Amino acid sequence: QGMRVAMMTREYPPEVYGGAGVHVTELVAQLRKLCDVDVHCMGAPRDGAYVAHPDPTLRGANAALTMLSADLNMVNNAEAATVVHSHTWYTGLAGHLASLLYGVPHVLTAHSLEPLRPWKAEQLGGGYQVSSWVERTAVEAADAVIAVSSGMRDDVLRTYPALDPDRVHVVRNGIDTTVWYPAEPGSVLAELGVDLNRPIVAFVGRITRQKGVAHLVAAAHRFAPDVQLVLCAGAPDTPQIAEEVSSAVQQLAQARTGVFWVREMLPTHKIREILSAATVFVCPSVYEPLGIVNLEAMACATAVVASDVGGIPEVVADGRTGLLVHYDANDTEAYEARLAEAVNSLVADPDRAREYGVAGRERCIEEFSWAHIAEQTLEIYRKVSA
Amino acid sequence: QGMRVAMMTREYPPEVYGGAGVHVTELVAQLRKLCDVDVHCMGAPRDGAYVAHPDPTLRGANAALTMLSADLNMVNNAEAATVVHSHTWYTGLAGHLASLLYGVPHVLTAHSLEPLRPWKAEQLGGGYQVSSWVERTAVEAADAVIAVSSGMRDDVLRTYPALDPDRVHVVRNGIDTTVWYPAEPGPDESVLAELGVDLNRPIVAFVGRITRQKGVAHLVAAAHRFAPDVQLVLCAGAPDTPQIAEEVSSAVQQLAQARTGVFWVREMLPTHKIREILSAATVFVCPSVYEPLGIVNLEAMACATAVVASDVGGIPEVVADGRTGLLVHYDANDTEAYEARLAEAVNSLVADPDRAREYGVAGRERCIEEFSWAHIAEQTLEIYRKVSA
Ligand code: NA
Ligand code: NA
């Protein structure tokens, strides 16, 4: 006799480290203003969440098995729910079993897809066979799947073609415009030696194949000579790509002045400082179903140059908030030239860069509010509960 | 490396209460003469087995949830296996998850199917939604499914069309020929003495519960047409309804008034006494209207006794018509023909005691040649070899 959401996550404060943990935290804060939400999470005991622990009998067993034991405690804890909403494969089996045991609908947000993970050795172990089976099982049986972009929805339906496309919904990611906002320098830019009197082109992200950092470093050879490139590019996912980016950065620094590389992962206030100071933020991703960093740059009122892959064109409004650059994997020479041409056009026309940045924060406030996302998410809970 | 079978069960000695538990107990004993087997079971701690328990912290949750909790401990315990063999939905997810986690084949024996459970109010609960999902998951992904009869093979293929039929194998239940064997009355407490049965007149034996399914009322009806000196020994108790208690009680009293040799044993009997009665009988009658397996027929055959049985369910895979026994056709729309033909088959074996005796000997031969657990274990090991290739 009243809707009660069991929100199932692995990460929740004070143990949020990834995009999926940030998403659940912000979604729950807004959803609680509309309906009753119980947070089901894993890790350390805390007030205000139902913490699902693994079976202590399984101490030292394979991580996949200890994770399933925590899932069964999570199902046990969720007995009051009228709808269960799971996040990440770590809780997929919890939402699947709670749905079966209690007769309640299962809503699943697809943050990532096990079959699309870039191949690493760990994909040869039993753990990946278990995580792949959980995600297939959870996704194919879910009452609703939420994708944050039409791009991610396409990837979900391609990866799991038994899915009813009518059960897969686009509900965008939000951005908190009280955390991400145009901030004058307090200074990370001083500790780098960046000259605030010269244009700044910024990148923020991990060094992975998918994030296309090598394409931006190649493009930067063609920037006007007083332009500074500030690369916030850390935590490379392979030693090979660390060497490729390191080598490309050294070749760039040989050809031009104003190259800066922040190798360490930065907190929010330092990222906000750099995104705010930038005239252009570049997202050169070759695969970007999500593209959250584009919302962060837009909320900091900075013009964006980005590829047209995945979800990016649903966030970056070409000729209004930024400029899209066509990516074709068979013509990376053209991609690199066209990234540079887009950056160069905004650096040459600072009034246009400023207007695009201003429009970017307006789009965040207008179209990518968590309050609006919470309302659309509640509409999915209504459809599956009817 | 060498083959190491993780045999996954809920029931194992000393906590065996049903057919699936008996099956694993006997199969493991004979498989251990051929290959290394680890017993993975649930319930009370014991020597000689990996006993899987739930998470202590899940004490008091839905029974389906604590069963999945025990399954994860069973998967953890089974890490040395080269093949995992599951029995009942209770261990289906243990075999499925061990196959995924360790990269080993999963053999599943189908003793029953969740979607074919005759409706009870408990099929409205979430527990049944969980048991149904486990079984469909485990069966559709198994490297091999062992069906305990032809009918169970047909039900598996009908209920689970996504499983490749080439992966479904019939391997039947066996019989211990050292506990069921032809046995003389013996000088100490002969049960046939106590009851006042005549060793020198023909004995027709029935052993089962008083249920619609076991058809004792059809045998009582047929018994009116037995030749006059024929003794009916009914080992029939535990009526499952007052209605059939009243009906069968009334029918046996009516039979007792009409003819002499009617002996109605209601108390449950131990093996040594069941053996004595089956051994002494000229004919054992299994008049079941529903009988998936028909194992009681193997007890009579191992005691070297002719069988008269209905042709329902699995009975014709155990009783060889015209060789170890006689099958009687059952049509629910014509129970009067069934009762007359039951009598005609019994009367034919009573009228031809050499034939009754030849069928009994063929019955014991069939037990030793085809239904010994040594043969069942050899056929099972062959499925392990096929899936391990
Ligand atoms: Na800016
Ligand atoms: Na006999």
Author numbering:
A (entry chain A): -1 to 184, 188 to 387
B (entry chain B): -1 to 387
Question: What does the study report here?
Answer:
One of the routes to α-maltose-1-phosphate is now known to involve the GlgA homologue GlgM, which uses ADP-glucose as a donor and α-glucose-1-phosphate as an acceptor. Thus, the enzyme uses ADP-glucose as the donor and α-glucose-1-phosphate as the acceptor.
Attempts to crystallize the α-maltose-1-phosphate synthase GlgM from M. tuberculosis were unsuccessful. We therefore switched our focus to the GlgM homologue from M. smegmatis, which shares 77% identity with the enzyme from M. tuberculosis. To help compare GlgA (a GT5 family member) with GlgM enzymes (GT4 family members), the X-ray crystal structure of GlgM from Mycobacterium smegmatis was solved to 1.9 Å resolution. The structural similarity between these proteins confirmed that GlgM had a GT-B fold. While the enzymes shared a GT-B fold and several residues responsible for binding the donor substrate, they differed in some secondary-structural details, particularly in the N-terminal domain, which would be expected to be largely responsible for their different acceptor-substrate specificities. Confirmation that GlgM forms a dimer in solution was obtained using size-exclusion chromatography. This indicated a molecular mass of 107 kDa, which is close to the theoretical mass of a dimer (87 kDa); the slight overestimation of this value could be owing to the elongated aspect of the GlgM homodimer. The kinetics of the enzyme conformed to a ternary-complex mechanism. Although the M. tuberculosis GlgM enzyme exhibited a trace of glycogen synthase activity, which was three orders of magnitude lower than its α-maltose-1-phosphate synthase activity, the M. smegmatis enzyme exhibited no detectable glycogen synthase activity. Likewise, we have been unable to date to obtain ligand-bound structures of GlgM, making it difficult to rationalize these structural differences with respect to function.
